[PDB]
Structure 1
Amino acid sequence: PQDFLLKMPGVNAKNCRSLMHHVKNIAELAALSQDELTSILGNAANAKQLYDFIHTSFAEVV
């Protein structure tokens, strides 16, 4: 379950530690805002990457 976490976009060896500290499990990742992710990662653009990975949706095809 950290194997999962690490292949997530904008997550690297340095911040896998720090993030495993402020969030229970992957599920809770869904639950955070971009700003709350920035602060937890200290990288605003890393936070963009991971937040976008998670919140991007297909639900189109009209």
Structure 2
Amino acid sequence: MDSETLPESEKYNPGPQDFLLKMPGVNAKNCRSLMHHVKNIAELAALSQDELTSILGNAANAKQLYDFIHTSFAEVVSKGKGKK
């Protein structure tokens, strides 16, 4: 919401914006609110689940997203050697 994030021409680049909308836990409603509360990927992944719950307004979306952010490429690949 700073001078750099406020788009004059207002195109909305379908790279990073769309990048959100394809993530589990994201809808356009909470994407736009997100978009105002986060910079991009870095800060999005830096945000806690609780922050996402505040932005998205649902712990469902927040958990889905937060979990997707933390799910290692080689995590779910295992079935549960260390049973949690």
TM-score (norm 2): 0.66
Question: 1:32 aligned to 47, 51, 54, which one?
Answer: 47
The offset of 1:15, in angstroms, is 1.0
Q: More helix per residue: 1 or 2?
A: 1
Cα-to-partner distance string for 1:22-54 (whole Å, 9 max, x where unaligned) = 001111111011111101111011100000000
The offset of 1:10, in angstroms, is 1.0
What is the Cα-based RMSD across aligned positions, in Å? 2.2
Give the number of equivalent residue pairs: 62
Contiguous gaps of at least 5 residues in structure 2 = 1-15, 78-84
The offset of 1:9, in angstroms, is 0.5
Q: Which of 1 and 2 has greater Rg?
A: 2
Percent of aligned positions with the same letter in both sequences?
A: 100
Tell me: CA distance 1:61–1:42, structure 2 relative to 1, closer, same or farther (3 Å).
Answer: closer
RCO (CA 8 Å, sep 6+): is it higher in 1 or 2? 1
